Design a protein around this ligand. Structure first.
Ligand SMILES: COc1ccccc1Oc1c(NS(=O)(=O)c2ccc(C(C)(C)C)cc2)nc(-c2ncccn2)nc1OCCO
Length: 411
């Protein structure tokens, strides 16, 4: 049909608006972030230098994506020359590669060592951050060479005036590129989206599950033996009155229950049948006022208030220390950065795998199908561009340390 033409022409209004917003917000946000990391000495040494690298991949994504490619939506003929069309997707593919790979090395270095007092997990090597930044950019350049080598320009003579263009050549010289030509939509999706997100989520989960276990060791060392904490869990499951309420509680409340078990034993905790039933029914304020009425509070008021506060609040506010602040800070920064990425490259990566799997020219239901696919793909482009500019903002909102470091540059 001739319907989706109006969609493309109308969307030209959206892309020019987004790209210009993305450009201004992108250059300012990453520059601020970049100046912040190098002004601070602890972050210059700390693994947050990887975030300074990510700010470079984002900032470089901005200055290749917005200037060159937005120029090609306005100008119908490709006007930069032959070398440039090998260079631009090279630059853009390597740039995205930097952003994903900076995320991965960040979470791996965070799991290797949570903070300065931590012990590196395996194969400690001095000044790893410098070594890791070098490896990230090289691999990002490598993954983008297939774009650069195969990108030549083709001349077409259109229905109106003639116009030359540039895309990835279908006719290719090496069997290397002939393979890459067809399987690029997967390569772009199976790598840039899957491997970075699979690797980063895996270490983030390993790290957060380790943080929790150490916070339990931390809270028990505060109120008063790693095998003792696991034997308590093993013994809680064996006790019949504690297993059901235990399985219902979340890891935070399970810890306070574990804390209660370390004082009185299983037999002693099993007596709060009124309070245990209230915890199962999620009536937190009730049991908190009800646990205050216990003799347990009178024997040790200070410690009980914290355990009661932990049951009431569900967060370690009563157990806040140096570690628990740091563990929460790192985990929130890593989590927020991956979530920003995933939500911005899913719409685009999902556009591609949906177009390759089920698309055929024979049917006439295309113009309802095609209209749906081109629209969602154009948004995915604006999503991916938004990621390049929404990373520096994301750190301010969910990182107390970054929100203050920006405020230090403010004043
Ligand atoms: C990270 O790599 C990608 C993985 C999956 C999808 C896209 C990817 O990178 C891309 C991507 N890769 S691509 O399809 O192979 C490509 C590269 C280069 C060109 C030019 C303009 C001819 C030089 C066309 C198409 N193309 C575009 C995109 N932009 C404008 C319009 C048409 N296409 N946006 C992406 O995302 C970033 C958004 O600013």
């Amino acid at each position: 049909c001739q319907g989706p033409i109006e969609i493309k022409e109308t969307f030209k209004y959206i892309n020019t608006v987004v790209s210009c917003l993305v450009f201004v917000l992108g250059i300012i946000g990453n520059s601020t972030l970049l100046y912040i990391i190098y002004k601070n000495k602890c972050m210059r040494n700390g693994p947050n230098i990887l975030i300074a690298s990510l700010a470079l991949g984002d900032l470089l994504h901005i200055v290749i994506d917005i200037p060159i490619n937005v120029y090609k939506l306005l100008a119908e003929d490709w006007p930069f020359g032959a070398e440039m069309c090998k260079l631009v997707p090279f630059i853009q593919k390597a740039s995205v590669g930097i952003t994903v790979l900076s995320l991965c090395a960040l979470s791996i270095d965070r799991y290797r060592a949570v903070a300065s007092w931590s012990r590196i997990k395996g194969i400690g090597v001095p000044k790893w951050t410098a070594v890791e930044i070098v490896l990230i950019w090289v691999v990002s350049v490598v993954l983008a060479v297939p774009e650069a080598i195969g990108f030549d320009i083709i001349t077409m003579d259109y229905k109106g005036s003639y116009l030359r263009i540039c895309l990835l050549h279908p006719v290719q010289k090496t069997a290397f590129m002939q393979f890459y030509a067809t399987a690029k939509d997967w390569w772009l999706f199976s790598f840039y989206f899957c491997l970075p997100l699979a690797i980063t989520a895996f270490f983030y989960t390993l790290m957060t599950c380790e943080m929790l276990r150490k916070n339990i060791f931390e809270m028990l060392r505060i109120d008063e033996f790693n095998q003792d904490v696991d034997a308590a869990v093993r013994g809680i499951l064996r006790n019949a009155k504690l297993k059901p309420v235990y399985d219902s509680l979340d890891a935070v409340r399970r810890a306070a229950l574990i804390n209660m078990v370390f004082q009185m034993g299983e037999t002693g905790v099993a007596g709060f049948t009124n309070s245990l039933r209230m915890l199962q029914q999620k009536r937190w304020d009730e049991a908190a006022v009800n646990l205050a009425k216990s003799r347990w509070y009178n024997q040790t008021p200070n410690r009980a208030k914290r355990v009661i506060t932990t049951f009431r609040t569900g967060t370690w506010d009563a157990y806040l220390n140096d570690h628990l602040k740091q563990r929460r800070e790192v985990a929130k920064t890593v989590f927020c950065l991956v979530l920003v990425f995933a939500l911005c490259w899913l719409p685009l990566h999902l556009a591609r795998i949906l177009k390759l799997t089920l698309y055929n020219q024979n049917d006439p239901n295309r113009c309802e199908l095609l209209s749906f696919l081109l629209v969602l793909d154009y948004i995915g482009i604006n999503m991916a561009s938004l990621n390049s500019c929404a990373n520096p903002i994301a750190l301010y909102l969910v990182s107390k340390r970054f929100k203050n470091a920006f405020k230090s540059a403010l004043c």
